[PDB]
């Protein structure tokens, strides 16, 4: 299990993550004040929505505003690359720097690190995170299609081999079969290969059941929406909690 | 679609069935009065819980009490055999007679008919039902294990070939894989072979997601509990409705 800021990820009900999206420092603050009136387990800051990413200082100041608003929340720092469905382009060097500066700031509890950034850079960044008691959600997204169950399982296995604390994969179904494929990979991963918590989701309307069935098939967390979704398929956070509770207590 | 007593089965959200269980005429009445203060789509009377099954008249009087309490509800008459997880033994002849008398009484809208009763008797009973504008939920249960997806699909295909209006299968998982197998059979049936609505469920705690994911994978109805479950895995009917509504509107 990963106990991150006094949340035990990998036990009990899947943990609810919400994504804060603000274009500037003022909107980040306003969003943090609104989010702290919702109930969820982990706050993801979607850094790629922030316009002034060119300044490491500006990014760190925004992280501090969030942390000041929610002193006790598990805080996940996520720059989603345009490659993997995020809002803007960034150089590899600047991406890694933003993450390292978030790590050594003491403001964040976890970073998201995209698997396909490159093995050497991944290893260096994972080691830096761990040296500062920061956990790594190592991630992969396919916003267009669903790989085979075999491919997804090997992808998640590689994340473990590279030191991910929590492997994560989000894929887009093009069919109902694709949703079942994602559930199948999740269960195979959890039963035969995982040695740590894993997060999986099938996106869009069609994939919604994957955001609900984490407890049965082995996804440790799931994303809900406070007002606006950060990815297709996310449902209102109160409704998500209601369903997770019903499944947990059945 | 099967529109039965002004309910369109096979469209929209999966329909909620609850099972009324009473040992005698007085308890059947009391249960009917309690059930009509719950919200659901179809009332199943579990005839095999009734003690005085030896008298066709007694069974018909009980059906009338239910119908008198709920004049407009779609009413499904179900004697579940001990073979398939019901409460008591019955001869084939008496089983078929109870069903035929329920059919020609005008009191019921549907009967449950177990596939493995025997082909000739199934055909005769299906024809009798249809001659009286009664629909047939043709059913199979395995309370101990989950057949292969291939076996389940061929079983449901056979039900269609024998004139079932709604094929139905309920199986017991012995693993999480078994739950996925049931979902896989459901989706394959609905996408490649069904030409009418089908009901599927994986029983027990482990199978609960199957009672929730009918809209995505192709199960037309699902069972909830008013106070007491008629089979393992059924959840409270208000909670079931809440989840189905959340999935429908996502
Ligand atoms: C992990 C993640 O990519 C997945 C997400 O795309 C989802 O589909 O919920 C939301 C996004 O904010 C998150 O970073
Ligand atoms: C259809 C049916 O056998 C299935 C059931 O066993 C279930 O698992 O919900 C309930 C039972 O009453 C019903 O007849
Ligand atoms: Cl807080
Ligand atoms: Cl397996
Ligand atoms: Cl009524
Ligand atoms: Cl298929
Ligand atoms: Na550094
Ligand atoms: Na491995
Ligand atoms: Na007759
Ligand atoms: Na067929």
Q: Which residues contact A123 (CB under 8 A, 6 or more apart)?
A: A162, A163
- Closest C-alpha to A115, from A78, A153, A169, A74: A169
The CATH number of residue A105's host domain is 3.20.20.70
CB contact B184 to A (< 8 Å): yes
Q: Which residues contact A138 (CB under 8 A, 6 or more apart)?
A: A112, A113, A114, A115, A122, A126, A159, A162, A163, A164, A165, A166, A167, A168
The kind and range of the H/E element at A157 are helix A149-161
CA–CA distance, A146 with A204 (Å, rounded to integer):
12
Determine the distance in angstroms separating the CA of A180 from the nearest CA of chain B, rounded to an integer.
7
- C-to-N gaps above 2.5 Å in chain B, after residues: none
Q: Which residues surround the ion ligand 7 when the cut-off is CB under 5 Å?
A: A 100
Cα Rg for chain A, rounded, in angstroms?
17
Q: Are A134 and A113 in contact (CB under 8 A)?
A: no
CA–CA distance, A28 with B8 (Å, rounded to integer):
47
User: How many other CB atoms sit within 10 Å of the CB of residue B150?
Assistant: 12
Structure-token pair, residue B167: 């094929």
* Backbone angle region of A141, left / alpha / beta, with phi > 0 → left and psi within -120 to 50 → alpha: beta
Task: State the first-to-last Cα distance of chain A, in angstroms, to the nearest integer.
Answer: 23
**Sign (positive or negative) of CA dihedral B169, B167, A207, A172:** positive
Number of domains composing chain B = 1
CA–CA distance, A202 with A204 (Å, rounded to integer):
7
Burial of B62 (0-12, 13-18, 19+ CB in 10 A): buried
Q: Which residues contact A87 (CB under 8 A, 6 or more apart)?
A: A46, A48, A49, A80
Q: State the helix-helix crossing angle for B149-161 and B176-188, rounded to 10 degrees.
A: 40
CA angle, B219 then B220 then B222, to 5°: 80
User: Which value in Å is the resolution of this experimental model?
Assistant: 1.4
Domain range enclosing B19: 1-250
Could you say which DSSP state residue A225 is in?
B
CA–CA distance, B172 with B174 (Å, rounded to integer):
7
CA–CA distance, A200 with A218 (Å, rounded to integer):
8
> Which residue in the block uniquely carries the two structure tokens 């997601």?
B209
CA–CA distance, A218 with A204 (Å, rounded to integer):
20
**Sign (positive or negative) of CA dihedral B32, B38, B42, B44:** negative
Cβ distance of B250 and A206 shorter than 8 Å: no
Q: How many helices (H) and strands (E) does chain A have?
A: 9, 10
Long-range contacts of B120-126 (CB under 8 A, 24+ apart): B121/B92, B121/B96, B122/B162, B123/B162, B123/B163, B124/B96, B125/B96, B125/B99, B125/B100, B126/B162, B126/B163, B126/B164
SS3 percent helix, strand, coil of chain B, rounded to 5, is: 45, 20, 35
CA of A155 to the centre of ligand 8 (A): 10
Ligand 2 atom closest to residue B222's alpha carbon, by position in its atom list: 9
Q: What residues in A contact B184, CB-CB < 8 Å?
A: 180
Q: What residues in B contact A191, CB-CB < 8 Å?
A: 176-177
Cβ distance of B187 and A206 shorter than 8 Å: no
User: How many other CB atoms sit within 10 Å of the CB of residue A62?
Assistant: 26
The kind and range of the H/E element at A62 are helix A56-69
Q: Are B250 and A211 in contact (CB under 8 A)?
A: no
CA–CA distance, B94 with B103 (Å, rounded to integer):
14
Q: Which residues contact A66 (CB under 8 A, 6 or more apart)?
A: A20, A28, A32, A43, A45, A75, A107
């Amino acid at each position: 299990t990963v106990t991150v800021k006094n949340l035990i990820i990998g036990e009990g009900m899947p943990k609810i993550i919400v994504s804060l999206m603000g274009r500037d420092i003022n909107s980040v603050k306003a969003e943090a004040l609104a989010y702290r009136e919702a109930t969820f387990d982990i706050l993801e800051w979607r850094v790629d929505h922030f316009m002034d990413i060119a300044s490491t200082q500006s990014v760190l100041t925004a992280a501090r505003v969030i942390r000041d608003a929610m002193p006790d929340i598990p805080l996940l720092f996520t720059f989603r690359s345009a490659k993997e469905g995020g809002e803007q382009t960034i150089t590899t060097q600047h991406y890694l720097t933003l993450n390292r500066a978030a790590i050594d700031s003491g403001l964040v509890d976890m970073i998201d690190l995209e698997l396909f950034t490159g093995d050497a850079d991944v290893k260096a960044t994972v080691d830096y995170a761990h040296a500062h008691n920061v956990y790594v959600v190592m991630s992969n997204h396919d916003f267009h299609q669903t790989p085979s169950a075999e491919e997804m399982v090997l992808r998640l296995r590689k994340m473990q081999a590279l030191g991910a604390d929590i492997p994560k994969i989000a894929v887009m179904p093009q069919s109902k079969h694709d949703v079942l494929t994602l559930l199948t990979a999740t269960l195979e991963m959890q039963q035969h290969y995982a040695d740590r918590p894993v997060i999986t989701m099938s996106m869009a309307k069609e994939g919604v059941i994957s955001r609900l069935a984490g407890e049965v098939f082995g996804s440790a967390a799931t994303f809900g929406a406070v007002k606006q979704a950060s990815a297709p398929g996310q449902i209102a956070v109160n409704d998500l909690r209601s369903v997770l509770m019903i499944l947990h207590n059945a």
